[PDB]
Design an enzyme around this catalytic site. Structure first.
Site, PDB file in Angstrom:
ATOM      1  N   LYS A  20       0.973  -1.145  -0.238  1.00 50.88           N
ATOM      2  CA  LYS A  20       0.042   0.076   0.014  1.00 50.88           C
ATOM      3  C   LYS A  20       0.750   1.334  -0.049  1.00 50.88           C
ATOM      4  O   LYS A  20       0.883   2.190  -0.912  1.00 50.88           O
ATOM      5  CB  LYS A  20      -0.803   0.023   1.248  1.00 50.88           C
ATOM      6  CG  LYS A  20      -1.721  -1.046   1.306  1.00 50.88           C
ATOM      7  CD  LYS A  20      -2.634  -1.025   2.285  1.00 50.88           C
ATOM      8  CE  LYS A  20      -2.148  -1.269   3.757  1.00 50.88           C
ATOM      9  NZ  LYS A  20      -1.243  -2.594   3.602  1.00 50.88           N
ATOM     10  N   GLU A  47      -1.715   5.574  10.568  1.00 51.42           N
ATOM     11  CA  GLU A  47      -0.325   4.577  10.256  1.00 51.42           C
ATOM     12  C   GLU A  47       0.943   5.064  11.140  1.00 51.42           C
ATOM     13  O   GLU A  47       0.584   5.332  12.101  1.00 51.42           O
ATOM     14  CB  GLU A  47      -0.310   4.925   8.483  1.00 51.42           C
ATOM     15  CG  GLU A  47      -1.185   4.044   7.791  1.00 51.42           C
ATOM     16  CD  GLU A  47      -0.690   2.537   7.919  1.00 51.42           C
ATOM     17  OE1 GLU A  47       0.420   2.111   7.642  1.00 51.42           O
ATOM     18  OE2 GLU A  47      -1.402   1.821   8.542  1.00 51.42           O
ATOM     19  N   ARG A  48       2.021   4.894  10.271  1.00 50.48           N
ATOM     20  CA  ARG A  48       3.192   5.042  11.141  1.00 50.48           C
ATOM     21  C   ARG A  48       3.782   6.368  11.123  1.00 50.48           C
ATOM     22  O   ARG A  48       4.128   7.157  10.267  1.00 50.48           O
ATOM     23  CB  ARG A  48       4.366   4.405  10.591  1.00 50.48           C
ATOM     24  CG  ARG A  48       4.192   2.836  10.779  1.00 50.48           C
ATOM     25  CD  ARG A  48       5.135   2.026  10.303  1.00 50.48           C
ATOM     26  NE  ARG A  48       5.104   0.355  10.251  1.00 50.48           N
ATOM     27  CZ  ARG A  48       4.183   0.010   9.423  1.00 50.48           C
ATOM     28  NH1 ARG A  48       3.418   0.780   8.414  1.00 50.48           N
ATOM     29  NH2 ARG A  48       3.883  -1.304   9.620  1.00 50.48           N
TER      30      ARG A  48
HETATM   31  N1  LIG Z   1       6.939  -1.701  -5.182  1.00 50.50           N
HETATM   32  C1  LIG Z   1       7.814  -2.546  -4.309  1.00 50.50           C
HETATM   33  N2  LIG Z   1       8.839  -2.850  -4.713  1.00 50.50           N
HETATM   34  C2  LIG Z   1       9.713  -3.494  -3.719  1.00 50.50           C
HETATM   35  N3  LIG Z   1       9.573  -4.005  -2.391  1.00 50.50           N
HETATM   36  C3  LIG Z   1       8.173  -3.284  -2.003  1.00 50.50           C
HETATM   37  C4  LIG Z   1       7.454  -2.822  -2.863  1.00 50.50           C
HETATM   38  N4  LIG Z   1       6.053  -2.559  -2.175  1.00 50.50           N
HETATM   39  C5  LIG Z   1       6.359  -3.324  -0.988  1.00 50.50           C
HETATM   40  N5  LIG Z   1       7.637  -3.702  -0.990  1.00 50.50           N
HETATM   41  C6  LIG Z   1       8.096  -4.474   0.274  1.00 50.50           C
HETATM   42  O1  LIG Z   1       7.052  -4.661   1.239  1.00 50.50           O
HETATM   43  C7  LIG Z   1       7.710  -3.872   2.493  1.00 50.50           C
HETATM   44  C8  LIG Z   1       6.656  -2.956   3.040  1.00 50.50           C
HETATM   45  O2  LIG Z   1       5.602  -2.615   2.093  1.00 50.50           O
HETATM   46  P1  LIG Z   1       4.809  -1.195   2.504  1.00 50.50           P
HETATM   47  O3  LIG Z   1       4.878   0.085   1.461  1.00 50.50           O
HETATM   48  O4  LIG Z   1       5.284  -0.680   3.861  1.00 50.50           O
HETATM   49  O5  LIG Z   1       3.658  -1.834   2.878  1.00 50.50           O
HETATM   50  P2  LIG Z   1       2.234  -1.365   3.685  1.00 50.50           P
HETATM   51  O6  LIG Z   1       1.030  -2.054   2.525  1.00 50.50           O
HETATM   52  O7  LIG Z   1       2.097   0.004   3.781  1.00 50.50           O
HETATM   53  N6  LIG Z   1       1.764  -2.199   4.960  1.00 50.50           N
HETATM   54  P3  LIG Z   1       1.580  -1.751   6.263  1.00 50.50           P
HETATM   55  O8  LIG Z   1       1.365  -0.291   6.384  1.00 50.50           O
HETATM   56  O9  LIG Z   1       2.305  -2.409   7.490  1.00 50.50           O
HETATM   57  O10 LIG Z   1      -0.001  -2.448   6.495  1.00 50.50           O
HETATM   58  C9  LIG Z   1       8.997  -3.010   1.717  1.00 50.50           C
HETATM   59  O11 LIG Z   1       9.799  -2.939   2.822  1.00 50.50           O
HETATM   60  C10 LIG Z   1       9.415  -3.812   0.684  1.00 50.50           C
HETATM   61  O12 LIG Z   1      10.165  -4.847   1.088  1.00 50.50           O
HETATM   62 MG   LIG Z   2       1.032   1.326   5.066  1.00 51.59          MG
END
Ligand SMILES: Nc1ncnc2c1ncn2[C@@H]1O[C@H](COP(=O)(O)OP(=O)(O)NP(=O)(O)O)[C@@H](O)[C@H]1O
Ligand SMILES: [Mg+2]
Ligand SMILES: Nc1ncnc2c1ncn2[C@@H]1O[C@H](COP(=O)(O)OP(=O)(O)NP(=O)(O)O)[C@@H](O)[C@H]1O
Ligand SMILES: Nc1ncnc2c1ncn2[C@@H]1O[C@H](COP(=O)(O)OP(=O)(O)NP(=O)(O)O)[C@@H](O)[C@H]1O
Ligand SMILES: [Mg+2]
Ligand SMILES: [Mg+2]
Lengths: 469, 37, 488, 466
Positions: D154, D180-181
């Site tokens: 996301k 979020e964070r």
């Molecule tokens: N486009 C991308 N390319 C490479 N790695 C990715 C990508 N998207 C996500 N990741 C991997 O997944 C990790 C975290 O994703 P992140 O954007 O923070 O997810 P999120 O959906 O925001 N989850 P969260 O907020 O914890 O519910 C990163 O540290 C990467 O290792």
């Molecule tokens: Mg997130």
């Protein structure tokens, strides 16, 4: 005695009496309405207030509105004059054919026939349906259960049982609509009018109608089953005469109650059903039975939520039957009708000492080869039709034929299949399967046995099939 | 557990397939033969 | 002595929250009677508890307060009905929200009217043409039937209803009053934006003029969404009671069930399966029965419903979903799997049935549509394989052809005669030696030809709704030669 | 008039009034407190007592404490001076840059646009992301939702979308951090000041930031969205501009609603949520929209608890979207980023009359071969690929090159992919796939299409592999 409404939440209405407090199960007339509104006393909340389920809508009730205690439970018109007439839940006629001038009214609520009143006689009742009469034969004056998930063939099957057994019945027959489609009520009515089982110009009518369908609030659907049962009760006792009782979906008796449980102040039980599910069903079923005074040949249609037979409603309904015909989406899906499961439909009289040894062996012989075939379904699911020893692949080839020969066109299902409904005599059914199990027709193509009557048409069709190629 | 395979999809359409296919030709195979007889 | 607030015809709010108002007084209201709030806001009275009336606010409840006067309306909830609503967009209570002024309406109808008993109905015999081959050929619908569209999110559900409504222009512009159909679209828990397209669309198909769109979007208070269906039903009934035929669409009974649950929860009635009320079944069974085919003694009109149900993870075997299914006379099931394979409309014949069947099909279509349905479902039996033997290779040869012939464009419905003409070209095997992917490009060219040069041919098939000998010939003449000139 | 606290349970506070009872939504100010503590009137309990929700911690409150009625809901600053600033639920600045001197203020509660204010204009918004561009294009003025489980994609996506879209945007944007964070706001803030979309000296800033992270109590996280939402509404209406509104996780708005619903005296709905989940949500999502008065391209990150898309929360969110980008952990675990589900992401814009038949015909070509490969996975897991026809093997192969050719390296993730970011054009994406399907590259190895921009870079990487 007169009471006043003190609370109205859905089908649940509270009425307070200052004079005398009506006993539970007593019908209460709500004054001030352009349509009779009956309230059944369900509980004694205390402080001179009773809680009641409405046998109709509560749209319009007012706190304080008067309520006249009729003195007794819901009493409806019974007797020969009901025949041909479509009745309500509270005995009101709904055919627009005026009043039902009856000389006797019975309470839809009554005790179940004692144990000393039970009959132990069992005479196979032939239905012309090969599968039924073959695997799980119905019995004269017994309790028939027809289970089935949504639209697998409960309604069409029960219809065939009326076109087959009712039409050729030397006696009266009761049909109760329990929370189904009003359109089906129309269909059944006009179709009975055609066949002449119902006469609008005279008194030869041999079936009584009771309806409380879907459009009806739970309270009604929660009692119509008992209404129709009462009408058939009178035909069983005050005559002794043979009575046939068809109830389309007794399951709506338990849902009805499941739709008003909470509002009756009841902690919910497993799967949301009422805690009283099994006992309500008990004081209801035990009444639908054959006593030493007369016999009731009942055929109930039983719904099975999401197709799950283990669902409390249906799982509790089994033991109340002496013969069960289970329908199977899986089977219907293979275009086999009636979609009766050969491995899940059972009958109490399926004993060699009641149908003889020949009849029994073939039945189990069918069931077995069909169970073996299920075992090969797997093995061939990964291997293919070329690994089974000539012995096994032989049974697979007979399973298919026996499977297909269980299907049968219904007179009532012409409009569907497009073929001419056939009616098979018992003996021709056994012979039919006796020969196929023998290996005799291993030279005929499966299709030859699909949707036919006696085993002959099979060969005949098989021939019409050879010439066309 | 008797016929769980068939009571599903993926490999069921297969079992369903091979199945019908087989008995399909077989019967035609038996079909003209009926004529012979 | 101010007596304007004698707690008999009026009340004073005791508590108000989450769209729920407990009213002291209202001593004379009826269960389910409309009530007016100070603000001019309305509400329905469901809870006639001893010490109060539980009133559910039909709107923004940030205006109601403790002590606010509530007034009886003396009327069970109703809505404006009649043909004036034709072509207008209204809210769940019947107020215009499309900014075009007062609704003519000279008649009101209770939203809770009881459904026709047994005697008044008559067998469903008149067709309800969707214009969608898959439906009309396999799941034919009759006027007075209740066909339930059900499926996962984003699978076509709504589009079927839209292609259906649009398809009604034909008759509605024609000369035969009997084949005219007025359509009522009801949006529940939907989004305004979404409904906007909806009505911009029906306007671009010139179908708004005979359509009553009833809308209660996401931002509307629960009761409005709960009431929405019965409101549109009531509007549909007015037609069903005057020798006219109305087609109603309950776009999403799931959301309706949702709102109903929310209301019940804040009225303090115990919850149940997945938390819905005890009578969620009655919620829908009560509404769908109102759909029906009246006999000639009652005008002989009708009201057909196409309630749309949404499933999650494709579980037709879930609460509500089975609740409705075990109510309607069949159901059209759409699946995401068939959608990506290219099968659009994603209708899975395997599970799609019509408890009306033949009873609802015209001669000609019945002819060519003969037994194509089981045949297709029987093609699926062959679908598991796809050194095939030429024979079965053939079963797999029709199914791949008919399939393309069933695909279609939106907002371009076909006259039942045009459909027969093309379906004919496929069903009579005349396209079996053509490249699937070419089928569609062909239907186009062909059709444009028949519709151009052969006005009279089609001109017949309709008039006789049947494919006569001379017509079975003049069609074999065209497909086979046209087809060949096409594969030049 | 003066109101007094009569009860406190976590974030729900009952305030009793002796005269003048505050209407629902009205914002009350708790007296005797160091920092401003707002309570939002949620209901009238009767007996002149109102039940409210705190917009901050309720520690230290004492029964009998005085509460004042502001006489109006929560009003926050809206206008150009919000741009470049960071504000909390109740509009107070939290960027240590002093008061936010805006002329107008706006209630964070408002009715959604009327049916007559609805817009029916659909016009693609190319993003440079092959999977989104291709299968489910985003729409200018549309509602884009990005579903994803914990750690799936996301955030990174929202970030890339701010990179590939926001920057080349001629107007004002609003980023709402919701549950979020916090260190992420920190990240965002400093990434924006860098790129320059935020300027602390000259008044050229183009982004307004509203935050109520996972450190906040339920009442806040439950309203922050409305605040960011309200700041976006000003720019849209009271200025008629094209407004971009990013919201990293609107799911938090619902989650929060559940914590307080409990304490409000509501019988709980399915899965413990509140009965008002659907409505509560509606009255908000409906305000996030484009009207005739202006546009709002909203991008909302949506958390899927326990990776369950049927969870009442996300489930209920799909109907409010014009485009959905569903992220999958299974896909992410195969190292495919963005972990977009080719077979579960949709766009109302995926219509031939809108994106052309060439685009639509390829899109459906891709969702067909992948769909067909997916249906073969049952056979592949038990009998391997020696049991597949020659035809099957062919699709499996093209599916695998299509799957990989769907991945793509984003700038915002270079650290995890070890590849320089890529921004692929639309035609280039249509082309790249038309070709893989037509079998034009059935000779190149799978690994060649993985993590690359256009198709050309799929070939380059092939030679290198030799
Ligand atoms: N486009 C991308 N390319 C490479 N790695 C990715 C990508 N998207 C996500 N990741 C991997 O997944 C990790 C975290 O994703 P992140 O954007 O923070 O997810 P999120 O959906 O925001 N989850 P969260 O907020 O914890 O519910 C990163 O540290 C990467 O290792
Ligand atoms: Mg997130
Ligand atoms: N004997 C039969 N031959 C052919 N089709 C049948 C037969 N029985 C049922 N069907 C088919 O299945 C449909 C409806 O079955 P029906 O008897 O109404 O099911 P049901 O069990 O009563 N379902 P429901 O009560 O709604 O849960 C019919 O419209 C037919 O298409
Ligand atoms: N026959 C068709 N051919 C091609 N695309 C179609 C067809 N029918 C529908 N669609 C498309 O499928 C998408 C959405 O389908 P839709 O009618 O909204 O399904 P739905 O079940 O109502 N989904 P929703 O209510 O949004 O959850 C749109 O992009 C439509 O244009
Ligand atoms: Mg039935
Ligand atoms: Mg829809």
């Amino acid at each position: 005695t007169t009471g006043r409404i003190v609370a109205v939440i859905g089908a649940v209405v509270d009425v307070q009496f200052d004079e005398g407090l009506p006993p539970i199960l007593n019908a209460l007339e709500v004054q001030g309405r352009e349509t009779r509104l009956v309230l059944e006393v369900a509980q004694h909340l205390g402080e001179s207030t009773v809680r009641t389920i409405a046998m109709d809508g509560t749209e319009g009730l007012v706190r304080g509105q008067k309520v006249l205690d009729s003195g007794a439970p819901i009493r409806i018109p019974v007797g020969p004059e009901t025949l041909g007439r479509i009745m309500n839940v509270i005995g009101e006629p709904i055919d627009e054919r005026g009043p039902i001038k009856t000389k006797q009214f019975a309470a839809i609520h009554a005790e179940a026939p004692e144990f000393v009143e039970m009959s132990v006689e069992q005479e196979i009742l032939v239905t012309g349906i090969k599968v039924v009469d073959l695997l799980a034969p119905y019995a004269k004056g017994g309790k028939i259960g027809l289970f089935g998930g949504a639209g697998v063939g409960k309604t069409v099957l029960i219809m065939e049982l009326i076109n087959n057994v009712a039409k050729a019945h030397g006696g009266y027959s009761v049909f109760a609509g329990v929370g189904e489609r009003t359109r089906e009520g129309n269909d059944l009515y006009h179709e009975m009018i055609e066949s002449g089982v119902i006469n609008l110009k005279d008194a030869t009518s041999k079936v009584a109608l009771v309806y409380g369908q879907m459009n009806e609030p739970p309270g009604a659907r929660a009692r119509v089953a008992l209404t129709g049962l009462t009408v058939a009760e009178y035909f069983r006792d005050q005559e002794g005469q043979d009575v046939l009782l068809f109830i389309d979906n007794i399951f709506r008796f338990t849902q009805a109650g499941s739709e008003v449980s909470a509002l009756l102040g009841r902690i919910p039980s497993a799967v949301g059903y009422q805690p009283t599910l099994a006992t309500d069903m008990g004081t209801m079923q035990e009444r639908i039975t054959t006593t030493k005074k007369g016999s009731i040949t009942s055929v109930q249609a039983i719904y099975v939520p999401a197709d799950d037979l283990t669902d409390p409603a249906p799982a509790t309904t089994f033991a109340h039957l002496d013969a069960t015909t289970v329908l199977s989406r899986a089977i219907a899906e293979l275009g086999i009708y009636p979609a009766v499961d050969p491995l899940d439909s059972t009958s109490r009289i399926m004993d060699p000492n009641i149908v003889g040894s020949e009849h029994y062996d073939v039945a189990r012989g069918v069931q077995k080869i069909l169970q073996d075939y299920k075992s090969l379904q797997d093995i061939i699911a990964i291997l293919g039709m070329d690994e089974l020893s000539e012995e096994d692949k032989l049974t697979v080839s007979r399973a298919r034929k026996i499977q297909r020969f269980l299907s049968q066109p219904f007179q009532v299902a012409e409009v569907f299949t497009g073929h001419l409904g056939k009616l098979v005599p018992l003996k021709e059914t056994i012979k039919g399967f006796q020969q196929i199990l023998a290996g005799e027709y291993d030279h005929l193509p499966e299709q030859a046995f699909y949707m036919v009557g006696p085993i002959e048409e099979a060969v005949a069709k098989a021939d019409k099939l050879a010439e066309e190629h | 557990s008797g016929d769980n395979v068939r009571s599903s999809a993926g490999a069921v359409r297969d079992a369903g397939g091979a199945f019908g296919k087989r008995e399909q030709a077989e019967e035609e195979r038996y079909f003209r033969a009926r004529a012979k007889e | 002595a101010d007596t304007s607030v004698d707690l008999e015809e009026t009340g004073r709010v005791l508590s108000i929250g989450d769209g729920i108002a407990r009213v002291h007084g209202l001593r004379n209201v009826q269960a389910e009677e409309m009530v007016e709030f100070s603000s001019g806001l309305k509400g329905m009275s469901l809870n006639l508890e001893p010490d109060n009336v539980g009133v559910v606010v039909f709107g923004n409840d940030k205006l109601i307060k403790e002590g606010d006067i509530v007034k009886r309306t003396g009327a069970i909830v109703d809505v404006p009905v009649g043909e004036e609503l034709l072509g207008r967009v209204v809210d769940a209570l019947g107020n215009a929200i499309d900014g075009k002024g007062p609704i003519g309406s000279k008649a009101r109808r209770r939203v809770g009217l009881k459904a026709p008993g047994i005697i008044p109905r008559i067998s469903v015999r008149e067709p309800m043409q969707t214009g969608i081959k898959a439906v009309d050929s396999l799941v034919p619908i009759g006027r007075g039937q209740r066909e339930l569209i059900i499926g996962d999110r984003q699978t076509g559900k709504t589009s079927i209803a839209i292609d259906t409504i649009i398809n009604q222009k034909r008759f509605n512009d024609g000369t035969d009053e009997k084949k005219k159909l007025y359509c009522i679209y009801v949006a529940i828990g939907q989004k305004r934006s979404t409904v906007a397209q909806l009505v911009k669309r029906l306007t671009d198909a010139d179908a708004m003029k005979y359509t009553i769109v009833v809308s209660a979007t996401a931002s509307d208070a629960a009761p409005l969404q709960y009431l929405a269906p019965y409101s549109g039903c009531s509007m549909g009934e007015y037609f069903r009671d005057n020798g006219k035929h109305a087609l109603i669409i309950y776009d999403d009974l799931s959301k309706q069930a949702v709102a109903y649950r929310q209301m019940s929860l804040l009225l303090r009635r115990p919850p149940g399966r997945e938390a819905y009320p005890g009578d969620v079944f009655y919620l829908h069974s009560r509404l769908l029965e109102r759909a029906a085919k009246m006999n000639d003694a009652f005008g002989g009109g009708s009201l057909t419903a196409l309630p749309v149900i949404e499933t999650q993870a494709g579980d037709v075997s879930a609460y509500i979903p089975t609740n409705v299914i075990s109510i309607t006379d069949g159901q059209i099931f759409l699946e995401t799997e068939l959608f990506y394979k290219g099968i659009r409309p994603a209708i899975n014949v395997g599970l799609s049935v019509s408890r009306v069947g033949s009873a609802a099909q015209t001669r000609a279509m019945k002819q060519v549509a003969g037994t194509m349905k089981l045949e297709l479902a029987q093609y699926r039996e062959v679908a598991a394989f796809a050194d095939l033997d030429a024979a079965t290779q053939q079963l797999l040869s029709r199914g791949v052809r008919l399939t393309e012939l069933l695909k279609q464009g939106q907002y371009s419905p076909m006259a039942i005669e045009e459909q027969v003409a093309v379906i004919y070209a496929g069903v009579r095997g005349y396209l079996d030696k053509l490249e699937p992917s070419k089928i569609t490009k062909f239907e186009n060219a062909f059709l444009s030809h028949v519709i151009s040069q052969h006005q009279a041919l089609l001109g017949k098939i309709r008039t006789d709704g049947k494919i006569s000998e001379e017509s079975d010939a003049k069609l074999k003449e065209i497909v086979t030669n046209f087809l060949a000139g096409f594969e030049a």
